[PDB]
Symmetry: C5
Subunit: 287 residues, 5 copies
């Protein structure tokens, strides 16, 4: 065994305060994000609404998930004057984050595929692969780090990490393929946005696997702190940063459909205070 479980390390009063600060800040940031997303939901045409439902869905999940994480943190540690001594429920803090990713990540895939130009079965087939792959990716990590031998088996820890990486590649390929296939059909402005969004999500993903293997280089209050805080910053940056991108795309693509005269939108669409489309009503219909 070379695996030093992070929920075994004792935390300083300062460390305990920092972890709580970032966790709650994150949760609040998501509530702010969720509120924004909801209010700016009708800025997108019915065609790209899947992008909105997915985003709002993930933010909702992330929000609640982080509430559990916070609770586990508060009920997972005891003050001993030598710092904060882990309980039997401290493991739940790490466990809870996996639960979040299991649901949050799959929704992120659909969100990206939603703004992609994939049509008919090609689209439906891609989603199924991505969702299943992303879900499996996280589950495999959960099995190795938490489930198997209480995450103390160095063999399993590494084995399932590799199995997970397999799924990670499957996901990256399907998404990259779908983005690259769509880019040609999109306008230059839309093409750029989609690419930007894809990069933010796919690129960020790398941080998670790296943090997973840190426990191998030993255990410590500081390390445990780094692991938790980093993952929090990662979750907030990716989820919020990426979400804003997919939205701007949906709007651009919506405005384009309006200008092209393919569809109509009941309000004017703006981006950085630059009008993209004008308000329009459908034609009155007789029966």
């Amino acid at each position: 065994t070379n695996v030093s479980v992070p929920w075994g390390a004792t935390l300083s009063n300062a460390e305990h305060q920092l972890i709580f600060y970032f966790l709650v800040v994150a949760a609040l940031a998501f509530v702010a994000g969720f509120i924004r997303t909801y209010i700016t939901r009708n800025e997108v045409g019915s065609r790209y609404r899947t992008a909105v439902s997915a985003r709002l869905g993930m933010l909702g999940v992330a929000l609640l998930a982080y509430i559990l994480i916070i609770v586990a943190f508060l009920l997972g540690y005891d003050s001993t004057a030598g710092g904060w001594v882990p309980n039997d429920g401290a493991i739940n803090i790490f466990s809870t984050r996996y639960i979040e990713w299991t649901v949050s990540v799959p929704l992120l895939t659909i969100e990206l595929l939603a703004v992609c130009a994939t049509l008919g079965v090609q689209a439906r087939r891609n989603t199924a692969i991505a969702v299943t792959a992303t879900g499996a990716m996280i589950f495999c990590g959960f099995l190795g780090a938490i489930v198997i031998d209480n995450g103390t088996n160095t063999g399993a820890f590494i084995l399932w990490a590799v199995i997970s990486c397999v799924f990670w590649v499957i996901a990256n390929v399907v998404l990259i393929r779908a983005v690259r296939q769509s880019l040609p059909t999109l306008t230059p402005e839309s093409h750029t946005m989609l690419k930007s969004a894809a990069i933010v999500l796919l690129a960020g993903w790398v941080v998670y696997p790296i943090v997973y293997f840190l426990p191998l280089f030993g255990a410590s209050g500081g390390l445990t702190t780094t692991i938790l805080i980093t993952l929090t910053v990662a979750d907030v940056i990716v989820k919020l940063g990426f979400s804003t991108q997919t939205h701007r795309v949906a709007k651009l693509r919506t405005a384009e459909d309006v200008r092209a005269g393919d569809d109509v939108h009941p309000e004017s669409i703006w981006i950085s205070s630059v009008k993209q489309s004008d308000a329009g009503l459908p034609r009155e219909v007789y029966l």
Copy 2:
């Protein structure tokens, strides 16, 4: 004697897996509930019953799973790598029955809502399905959780059979209603309705099977299998089925628009393929 599943002690790994699936399920429903709500006006007033039912069931399922999670957290006590069941462990299974009692009946209405059944034929069908589905679950609750604290092998089987009677009544009514509708619906609508019906009716089989597992003995592993399986089942059927009935409602809504029977204020899409165009009702000048 029936080996009650809430009597079996669970490993730290088993306890973690059950929690993982339960919470994931609840979160999945939140995601589902949110989507359903946002995509509620993608359907005409005619098939709104399908939306209200779906959102209703997801809402119920969501809250129900919160209770299940709570019961699970208060149902077991940690004994150094093992989780020993307490008096409240039974509530975990009990809570799921409460969920089904309300969730299943709504699923029936949701299916019947997208069906072409008209007038009394429709209203009569719903009543039978709802009552049957509710009874089906209640019977199971009595046999497994209520009667002799779920330790009576005779009752466990008796009420299971009584339940199966109701299960057949439900399957028949729904299958007949779907079969009757399919002919009047378009090919695209026909396919979707059939697909939706299969997902619900087919999945249902899993529940009765898992019910009788406790007869083949008791164990931490078995108890784990029972819980996880039911969770996966609930999520897959409820979200799988729900997604289908929605796609139907939209298709049927778009058709009514194209046919010029009604109008919708926004364009309707399915897999990024336009089904109907945005249209406004004609302005009318009242006597004034």
Copy 3:
């Protein structure tokens, strides 16, 4: 006979499970009802919106009320070798239901009067009498069964029950009068619906007074169970059963106003998959 308070009887593990099952199922059913009512709120014209606001209001109340009832139930009994022994808080279970009715019943009256053709003062006067009568009816029952001598006084139990019945008649008369007076002015189809709705509510009401006097025929775990479960079934059946009816009415009356050309509705109105009215927009106005 003499009054045997139901919160004094010890309950079996089976009885305890049954009561919890029905209580939670009821609360969830209300959530389902509340959600439906809210989503199907714009299926009714502004004229009959009082019917919707009242329904949603009562369902909201019922929902929260049942949450308290459930809490009281969980804190009302203690698990022993003899089953579930009642504590000091067991009385709160029954008390809470009265609180529910005090608010829920009055709203039901307004809901019925809302779909009635009562105009001007005749309408406003009726509401005041019904609300005050219904509120008093429940309050009187609360005083006799719970408040006065801790519900151990057989005399009060009966006296206030009679006083309550007086109010019950006052309410039934006002409502019946209003329904009978309206029926003539409405269409045959609307006439039938209103009558049906009135019957469902007024008829069900009888169950409550009957269950009130059961404690006189003695006390027992089984009886206590019957009292609770029956009232739960009653609440759910009446509240959802009646509500669905008054809604169907509001829609029919709304569709009629549209067909008659008295008003316009922005969406088509349906009943059992039969179109009642077509979608229409108001005429554009220059100011």
Copy 4:
């Protein structure tokens, strides 16, 4: 010297009655809040401040009463003598002050919103009313709860007088604003506004009276009367008044439609009598 009401022991009957009214009140507010929200688009954009204020106050009142209920459940302990007050019993009365501090000010804005006050005259009035009403409650809190745990009879009376000063300032500003508006409004609108103002301003008298009751001694019965009365008062004034200001907003909205000053997308009704017909804004080219 002042017989604090949270010192008196309560009977099982008294305890049950207080709980009954508290919860009923909270539920009534939920019912009110729901209605207010659903009937929010029955009013023109011009008088929307009246709606936002009402929904705001009902929301506050609702949550406030939840705390009051919690405080009540943790404020008394069941004994052989009935329900004995603990250290947290004071919080029950304290919580109500918190409610009023926020609820009352919103009620003023709600009334001023349906008033015809224009420009600075309007903005100035609201500020005075809000600040006065907030101070009024704060002063009462200081005398009855904060200062010597409400045991100083001098302060109890002093701050009550200081509060009454603010109470007069508020009543004057509101009455002036209502009187100034009445002339510009229709007879039907005039009557409603007056009715609404009376319900709020008149009811207000009950609160100061109940405040000074503790001076005439302490008792389980008195304590019960104080709590229940204030609850009935809160419910009656808040829902009674609110319903009135709403009816006004609608009438004033319908008038603007008929007068051809604005347009509303749905027909407006009052007691089943059509006030305005549905109208759509004219489609405009840019």
Copy 5:
């Protein structure tokens, strides 16, 4: 350690009551604010919607944040013969407020920048600086007062306060520059409102740094009380005061766009009972 942590001072029953009163009042005021903001969300054109989303976002955060603060306060002190004695969790009361500011303040910046006329890159770049600066400003303060040596290092308390002030100036400059640059393009009425809003936010901000250094003048139940109440009044006044202003702006700017014939709004826009714009519908379009 010339720093006298405020969570070390014991509080009187009167002090304890006053703190609770203001905290809850604040939270309720935000609920009232949040409700208003939500209902009056469609009083603004799509162009200035960022101003609404930001405000509703901050009010939502502030609301929840104050709930935690209230909880921390209830679990932070224990009632004794000497009054209310601070426990280990008393520090959390102050800690929680920092969490609030960390999220609330940044959103306030975006809210102001949203009503500003900044276009293209200049606008996007400004937001990034403001958000990062404001977030850092609060984080730095948190490090000095709470994180470092449990807030006992007098040197750090001052050092990080200075580092924070640096960020405070960076933020004030960016915002002031953006407001000054916009003023010229806006109408006189709009110009005045924007200026008023900016003043309320930027001016109020000064109170926070001042209250931060009060613990240096010693410790007291009274001092601790003053610090908490003042910050609460500050939060409520700035957040509601400023928010109301930025809203009035968004409406004026929306009405202007309508009058100028640049866009259309489906309802009439009013300010203090004075009509600014009339209701207008987009022109019906026949698609190809």
